Amino acid sequence: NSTATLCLGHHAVPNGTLVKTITDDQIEVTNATELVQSSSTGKICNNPHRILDGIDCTLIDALLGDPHCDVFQNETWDLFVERSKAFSNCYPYDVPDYASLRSLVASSGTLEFITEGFTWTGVTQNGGSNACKRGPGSGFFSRLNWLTKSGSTYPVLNVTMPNNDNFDKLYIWGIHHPSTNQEQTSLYVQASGRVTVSTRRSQQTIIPNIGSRPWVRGLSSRISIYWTIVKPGDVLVINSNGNLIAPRGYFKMRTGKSSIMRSDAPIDTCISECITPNGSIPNDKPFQNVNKITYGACPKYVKQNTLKLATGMRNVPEKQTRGLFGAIAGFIENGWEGMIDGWYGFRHQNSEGTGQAADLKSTQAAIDQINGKLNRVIEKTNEKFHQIEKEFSEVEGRIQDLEKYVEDTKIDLWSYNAELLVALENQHTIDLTDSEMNKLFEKTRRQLRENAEEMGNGCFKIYHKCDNACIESIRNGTYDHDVYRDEALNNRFQ
Amino acid sequence: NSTATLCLGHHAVPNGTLVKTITDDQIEVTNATELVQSSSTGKICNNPHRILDGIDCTLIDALLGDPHCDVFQNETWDLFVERSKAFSNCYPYDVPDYASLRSLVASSGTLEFITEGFTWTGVTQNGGSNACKRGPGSGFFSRLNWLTKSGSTYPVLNVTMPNNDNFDKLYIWGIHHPSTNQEQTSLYVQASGRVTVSTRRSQQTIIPNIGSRPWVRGLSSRISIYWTIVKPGDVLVINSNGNLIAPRGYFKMRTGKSSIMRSDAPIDTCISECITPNGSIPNDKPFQNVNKITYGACPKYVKQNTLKLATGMRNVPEKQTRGLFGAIAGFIENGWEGMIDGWYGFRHQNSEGTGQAADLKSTQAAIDQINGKLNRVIEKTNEKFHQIEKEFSEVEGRIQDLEKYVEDTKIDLWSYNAELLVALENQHTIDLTDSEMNKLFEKTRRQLRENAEEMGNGCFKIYHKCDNACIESIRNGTYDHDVYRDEALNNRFQ
Amino acid sequence: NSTATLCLGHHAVPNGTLVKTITDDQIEVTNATELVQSSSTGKICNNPHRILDGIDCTLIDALLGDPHCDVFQNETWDLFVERSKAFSNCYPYDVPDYASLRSLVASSGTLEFITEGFTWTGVTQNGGSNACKRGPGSGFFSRLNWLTKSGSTYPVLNVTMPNNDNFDKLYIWGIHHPSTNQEQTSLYVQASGRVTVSTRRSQQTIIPNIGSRPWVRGLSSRISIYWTIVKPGDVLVINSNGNLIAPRGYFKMRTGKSSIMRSDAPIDTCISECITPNGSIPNDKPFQNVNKITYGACPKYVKQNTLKLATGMRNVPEKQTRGLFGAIAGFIENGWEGMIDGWYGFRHQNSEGTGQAADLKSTQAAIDQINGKLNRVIEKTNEKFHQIEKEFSEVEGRIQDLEKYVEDTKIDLWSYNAELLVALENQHTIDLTDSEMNKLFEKTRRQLRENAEEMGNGCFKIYHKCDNACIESIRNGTYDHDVYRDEALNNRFQ
């Protein structure tokens, strides 16, 4: 024989995954990764963020100093975890703007308490109740001072405390709401109380409300909790004529990365940066689908459960529809399921035999750009610490509707971003792999000047006698057309 | 003659629309669709959502039971429609946090009222006024009970009602603000009222304010409306010493898809899923430009009035600049305005005659991907029910500024998304149609191995004698080069 | 010699900038622009928006009429600028919902004040204090009237004022909080005050709070400021029995483009549309990185400091690795650093000599589309006037957390948009420049039918005798293959 066949092609596999592109909803690739984390271990990892498990304590009971919460004094945290089995076992109380105080104390990240010398004059301190039993005796919140009439008098109280330090000081105080007109007089000589608490720049005044409420732990009376922040250089004044739950000291305040989360997952020993209420998740993927609530370095929440990024080429599973020869057939036809060493490669039919090989230059380069794509996409800063509430237990009206509207707007815009990026990138991936294929072909055609012709099967009918060494030279990039030119021209045109 | 001409091309039209792509602000396509709905019928369609037209009633007058609003008792709705001609004809009143109560009742979607056995003891019930005439006699809101002194006394009222059911119970109540110190004593024996209303977990106390206001319907006094929600397992207590507008029962509460809209459009019999204040619009297109306020499955609001998606190729209107022969001219030159059967096609000049035909394989495939594009783009879930207010009649300050800022941020981000998607998709459309053209050419060149040559007009000078059957074979995909090879080689090279 | 060489190529430069594309994080282009403005002059330009510098005055002291703020009466502005050295030198005061009133007055844009005939009857007007010295004498806010007991009486005050005009009227009023029970009686005969201020549709009632506060400028008493808006057709009533700081007139209200900014930059004579707290910036670029707070037509704020848009092609710096001949080498190899006239061009080796030239058709067109890209990208409407606060000095809790969350969400979504647009556009730029190159090549190959062959260096071995005129004809687009066909065919194939 006086002629040779040389064909080009790309690897195929037996089993493929389907991806979403621009034009079409399904297409079959050789390999594809997942970009959405769907699963959790179900436990909270204790490194590298410092976790503080509240057990039967809320953060507002720990601060006030409820008796079953005395483990928590001078504690610090990055994340505080509240449990759904938590309860209260002291005087019954309410906090106007509860939500604001809870958010302020959680971002501070400490319960550091400094006792101060306050001089209450002409009154009896350390009032108590059997709604709050610390041991067999009656008790009260550890950080507040119930004041009551001494003898037959409650004098107008007037005290001042100045900030001369270089940090901010948070004072918690309150007021008692008695259930009758006969209890008010019994505790405080007057008939109507008043509590005024002021700085140089602000003031608040509260009056007490009298009347009957549902029984909780044997009482139809309640306490109302308030707060004031005093800056460096400013003064505090307190001026009450009755019903004052006085402060005992101040709390230090920091700006940092601390927050709070309501969860029911157990705590465990392991290392994880992202925490959700369903336990810790890994942060290798760019998106997540576990929970919209998060803490620390985390993937973005989206609505989808699956987004597949193509890491391979298109998969034309082979025509075992073949000839007697299974005449070597190239890329224009189908893929090659018998190639393992590399993606792009050459099959040669010669007098010597049939053969096969792979190509490093091309296979390397494709792999390079696809790996690039992967790196821009998979990994980046989304490191976030304190945020709005995204779950509610009551109906409130206006503010809560705006908080729900803000969160849904964010989710639909990030979900649209995630859908388009995958479709764009998947199209570009198919295109770059197919151009790479056609680049090897033109390189081959350019080397075989007039000593070869194209058939249109993906194949080059060479009109001279090519041996294994000659095929190897073409494959190599050293084929010297001049040597066989005269023979090939006389063979092809005559 | 011993030779033939075969040219390739694509269809042109006489009149075209202009589209926006990546690079340029205008370009001329063969056909293009609209993606923004600009128009409305001006009527509200009554299926498939249940519409309740308020006529001269607001939703807050229907709930309280104003006399001209007694048609509305035990009503239900998906959407409630308020009219701008609506007024009030009862006792003059104000609701602190009016906006919150209106939003809460609208999302519930019912006015189901259950009368309860409340025991008011030592007082006269069913107080009345000629500001609210139900028939010739004086009257009052149907769902509230005005209580007044019996003989020369108003006892301290103390009542309780427990929730033992498995649903939430909404109580509406209020307080009277008399205009003098002489009217307060006349209605209630005391000089100053007080109203306390509490659960196990919450409390509210209101005091009445006395003084003179503008006359409305013959009165300088007003009523203030309040509300409490009681959960399954909890209790309600009410404790007033004067000025109490007592409740008569509770309202049931649901979670569902109900809302409210201020409109002035008439109601009609037809089927439409999306409702706006300018009437119902169809939901075939992805974007909308009619109104930012919506209900149900709807397109997204954007700022643009027009966005055109190219559904065709580029339009090179023909060179009637021609030869004596109008020598058949291909795609490299211009488009063909004389082709009707299909997009891509062949024109042959032969000894037998001039001719023309179209190509199904190509025309089909292009049409296929363009139709795909259309489907990803035009249709999807945007199904939304209760949202924030987006129009305001008064100035309020902070909250309203944040609500306006949230809405404008959303609009500019969705408008940028709509501008880029059209430009991206339009570029891809032009590219896919032009590659499809060049694909048919290479297929043709590959079949005509050495028996044809390229001229560069988009045309193939075939150096053998081609008849109609031969042209048909090329067009077909069965052309056998071997038959005419010797003749063509001797004709072209010698 | 009987043959010729003709090669094609594109311009290279010595020094290049690196851009970010889809696949890769760095690549070297010939030229690139900046899209993020990083710098400011540090001054506020006084045209074309009307700037009003407050010097030691806040906007809330200018409105009340503090003595060191009497320059500001009947002023108007587009932007009001407050300075950090500003202070207060009158009666000490607080405004509940301070933030709301400041935002309302800033968007109005005027301090136009109309004195009205209010008849205060049985009281002494124009009360004074040495905390507010206007000259040697005692003084008070210019726009408020302190009223006090006449003889031994303060009658119940009852006044009305109707709006019969066609615009909205803003009344500012207040209430005095005395420090003792002995001062209250001294100023107002009664023991407890009350102030009720109402329209047909709204009402507010305030009570005064008595007790001791920190000393500011020799006083332990304070004033509380309130406000009411009265619409066209409505009435105002005022009904106080004590402690009323009465209004003297109303302020007109407009809807317009006015706002306020806290800055410390000096004012200068120049023209600039965008103002930031760090001074005016130019608005030629689409993004900005100077400050998130802005006024007027401005670029969008993003987190990045640099985004480079490729305005040129890729830069293969030349192989000075060469031959003895430096045989002319084309684009497949490297770029040409010796070409100045244009981007794409031709180098010819002939018997006559070596030579070089450039190509207008191609160079023009590339430049055209790149300039197009630039125009869509760089310039558009972002013209915005009044917005939310984005910096806070105190901790407040809930509302402030939602305002901070809304702003960060907006920034991360606009930063992601800015990163993808640059990467998309940069890829498209590289692609359009490289296709333009390959378009000139095919045009050249198409003209040289069988009288030339391709070598694969980017070069055309022409197998006939080409002189300068012949090379010029090819370059020109008038090369007539027929003339040299026989000679070339006999030279190449035999």
Ligand SMILES: *[C@@H]1O[C@H](CO)[C@@H](O[C@@H]2O[C@H](CO)[C@@H](O[C@@H]3O[C@H](CO[C@H]4O[C@H](CO)[C@@H](O)[C@H](O)[C@@H]4O)[C@@H](O)[C@H](O[C@H]4O[C@H](CO)[C@@H](O)[C@H](O)[C@@H]4O)[C@@H]3O)[C@H](O)[C@H]2NC(C)=O)[C@H](O)[C@H]1NC(C)=O
């Ligand atoms: C205004 O109106 C309100 C509402 O009615 C009144 O509030 C009620 O006040 C009474 C008297 O204090 C309360 O009665 C008490 O209820 C307690 C809770 O009951 C639970 O526990 C018992 C015991 O297991 C169960 O039997 C019962 O089903 C509940 O599960 C009881 O513990 C109290 O018992 C006390 O008295 C008995 C006497 O036999 C002793 O054995 C006990 O040890 C204990 O000392 C008592 O029965 C009632 O609960 C209140 N109602 C609510 C819902 O709060 C106001 O009193 C009223 N005020 C005025 C001024 O009129």
Ligand SMILES: *[C@@H]1O[C@H](CO)[C@@H](O[C@@H]2O[C@H](CO)[C@@H](O[C@@H]3O[C@H](CO[C@H]4O[C@H](CO)[C@@H](O)[C@H](O)[C@@H]4O)[C@@H](O)[C@H](O[C@H]4O[C@H](CO)[C@@H](O)[C@H](O)[C@@H]4O)[C@@H]3O)[C@H](O)[C@H]2NC(C)=O)[C@H](O)[C@H]1NC(C)=O
């Ligand atoms: C504190 O200050 C306030 C504000 O001034 C006082 O409020 C005013 O009180 C008077 C007395 O109640 C009100 O006068 C009444 O106005 C009604 C509305 O007027 C409209 O309708 C009439 C009739 O069509 C028109 O003529 C008029 O132009 C208006 O369009 C009148 O209807 C009332 O008429 C009554 O008396 C006449 C007597 O001739 C009878 O014919 C009528 O049938 C009817 O009985 C009356 O004139 C006045 O409107 C109040 N002002 C406002 C704006 O509310 C407080 O009284 C004052 N309080 C104290 C304690 O000092």
Ligand SMILES: *[C@@H]1O[C@H](CO)[C@@H](O[C@@H]2O[C@H](CO)[C@@H](O[C@@H]3O[C@H](CO[C@H]4O[C@H](CO)[C@@H](O)[C@H](O)[C@@H]4O)[C@@H](O)[C@H](O[C@H]4O[C@H](CO)[C@@H](O)[C@H](O)[C@@H]4O)[C@@H]3O)[C@H](O)[C@H]2NC(C)=O)[C@H](O)[C@H]1NC(C)=O
């Ligand atoms: C309830 O409790 C509060 C808090 O203690 C009391 O408020 C104090 O009241 C007193 C008396 O008014 C105030 O004392 C005054 O302080 C002024 C400010 O002091 C600064 O300036 C002086 C002078 O430069 C400095 O020496 C000092 O270090 C501060 O920088 C003084 O200016 C006042 O001086 C007056 O008296 C002196 C007498 O020698 C004269 O020379 C002066 O000219 C002037 O007339 C005075 O000393 C004190 O500041 C208040 N404390 C605060 C922080 O406000 C309430 O009085 C109390 N109320 C009741 C009912 O008990």
Ligand SMILES: *[C@@H]1O[C@H](CO[C@@H]2O[C@@H](C)[C@@H](O)[C@@H](O)[C@@H]2O)[C@@H](O[C@@H]2O[C@H](CO)[C@@H](O[C@@H]3O[C@H](CO)[C@@H](O)[C@H](O)[C@@H]3O)[C@H](O)[C@H]2NC(C)=O)[C@H](O)[C@H]1NC(C)=O
């Ligand atoms: C809770 O924290 C307070 C405050 O202490 C601070 O926080 C701790 C966790 C540590 O980090 C401390 O380093 C930090 O200051 C503790 O208050 C401390 O109480 C002791 C005992 O009363 C104080 O010692 C005093 O020392 C002075 C002399 O300098 C004597 O005059 C006193 O009589 C007394 O002995 C100590 O100064 C004080 N720390 C303060 C105010 O800075 C508190 O004990 C701690 N409680 C628990 C349960 O850990």
Ligand SMILES: *[C@@H]1O[C@H](CO[C@@H]2O[C@@H](C)[C@@H](O)[C@@H](O)[C@@H]2O)[C@@H](O[C@@H]2O[C@H](CO)[C@@H](O[C@@H]3O[C@H](CO)[C@@H](O)[C@H](O)[C@@H]3O)[C@H](O)[C@H]2NC(C)=O)[C@H](O)[C@H]1NC(C)=O
């Ligand atoms: C408005 O709705 C209330 C509540 O009824 C509920 O809503 C209705 C629209 C229907 O869907 C009802 O199926 C649903 O329960 C109506 O209250 C109803 O009033 C009647 C008459 O008083 C009650 O009948 C009573 O039946 C008991 C015996 O079971 C007798 O002891 C009573 O004397 C009385 O005859 C009925 O139970 C009650 N429904 C309740 C509380 O569930 C109300 O009539 C209705 N009004 C209008 C204008 O439609």
Ligand SMILES: *[C@@H]1O[C@H](CO[C@@H]2O[C@@H](C)[C@@H](O)[C@@H](O)[C@@H]2O)[C@@H](O[C@@H]2O[C@H](CO)[C@@H](O[C@@H]3O[C@H](CO)[C@@H](O)[C@H](O)[C@@H]3O)[C@H](O)[C@H]2NC(C)=O)[C@H](O)[C@H]1NC(C)=O
């Ligand atoms: C501040 O502005 C008020 C209101 O005037 C309005 O704003 C000004 C800046 C100008 O633009 C005015 O054109 C505009 O109306 C000034 O009030 C004005 O005061 C004068 C003097 O009292 C009033 O003149 C009166 O004229 C009538 C006859 O028409 C006489 O009966 C009066 O006795 C008196 O002479 C003038 O009408 C009034 N403008 C009003 C109410 O519209 C105010 O003077 C001005 N102050 C400063 C510091 O500029």
Ligand SMILES: *[C@@H]1O[C@H](CO)[C@@H](O[C@@H]2O[C@H](CO)[C@@H](O[C@@H]3O[C@H](CO)[C@@H](O)[C@H](O)[C@@H]3O)[C@H](O)[C@H]2NC(C)=O)[C@H](O)[C@H]1NC(C)=O
């Ligand atoms: C325009 O002016 C603004 C301020 O009005 C400049 O922003 C400020 O930039 C400095 C330097 O980055 C910041 O200081 C740093 O703050 C951090 C956090 O507290 C601290 O850890 C550092 O040690 C340092 O003090 C300052 O906070 C920042 N202000 C804000 C609110 O961001 C801005 O850089 C100026 N821009 C131009 C173009 O001049």
Ligand SMILES: *[C@@H]1O[C@H](CO)[C@@H](O[C@@H]2O[C@H](CO)[C@@H](O)[C@H](O)[C@H]2NC(C)=O)[C@H](O)[C@H]1NC(C)=O
């Ligand atoms: C298809 O892509 C997946 C990507 O998950 C490849 O899976 C990796 O396989 C290697 C084998 O050594 C593991 O070490 C990795 O942990 C796997 N996952 C990741 C994160 O890369 C898989 O090998 C690819 N298959 C083919 C046939 O190429």
Ligand SMILES: *[C@@H]1O[C@H](CO)[C@@H](O[C@@H]2O[C@H](CO)[C@@H](O)[C@H](O)[C@H]2NC(C)=O)[C@H](O)[C@H]1NC(C)=O
């Ligand atoms: C150009 O595109 C428009 C798209 O609106 C085509 O209009 C449709 O024409 C058919 C004709 O049978 C109607 O049944 C449809 O209702 C039309 N609208 C839609 C929604 O598709 C139009 O036919 C196209 N023209 C050409 C020449 O292709």
Ligand SMILES: *[C@@H]1O[C@H](CO)[C@@H](O[C@@H]2O[C@H](CO)[C@@H](O)[C@H](O)[C@H]2NC(C)=O)[C@H](O)[C@H]1NC(C)=O
């Ligand atoms: C590279 O691009 C920059 C863009 O900044 C060009 O810089 C411009 O140069 C002209 C020279 O006449 C100036 O008038 C402009 O003000 C410059 N800036 C702008 C805003 O265009 C620069 O000329 C380009 N360089 C090359 C080699 O093409």
Ligand SMILES: CCCCCCCCO[C@@H]1O[C@H](CO)[C@@H](O)[C@H](O)[C@H]1O
């Ligand atoms: C190349 C075409 C890009 C298609 C962009 C997506 C258009 C509609 O895409 C939709 O986005 C939703 C998020 O809002 C996702 O939940 C849906 O899965 C998706 O269908």
Ligand SMILES: CCCCCCCCO[C@@H]1O[C@H](CO)[C@@H](O)[C@H](O)[C@H]1O
């Ligand atoms: C391929 C280039 C993409 C251009 C993206 C749009 C850049 C500016 O585009 C602008 O977006 C505005 C919405 O904010 C629209 O109102 C304007 O019509 C549009 O010009």
Ligand SMILES: CCCCCCCCO[C@@H]1O[C@H](CO)[C@@H](O)[C@H](O)[C@H]1O
């Ligand atoms: C073609 C690939 C597009 C990459 C899109 C950007 C994916 C992550 O991109 C990140 O966006 C951040 C804004 O949130 C920027 O601050 C970071 O610089 C950028 O790395």
Ligand SMILES: *[C@@H]1O[C@H](CO)[C@@H](O)[C@H](O)[C@H]1NC(C)=O
């Ligand atoms: C082929 O190229 C290699 C380098 O990759 C070279 O060592 C070898 O001599 C070349 N010739 C053959 C084996 O084709």
Ligand SMILES: *[C@@H]1O[C@H](CO)[C@@H](O)[C@H](O)[C@H]1NC(C)=O
């Ligand atoms: C062309 O192809 C058709 C099938 O599409 C076949 O039936 C016919 O015989 C073929 N030959 C001709 C008419 O060219």
Ligand SMILES: *[C@@H]1O[C@H](CO)[C@@H](O)[C@H](O)[C@H]1NC(C)=O
């Ligand atoms: C080349 O083209 C120009 C027009 O651009 C023409 O004037 C000239 O005669 C042509 N022939 C030559 C110089 O190649």
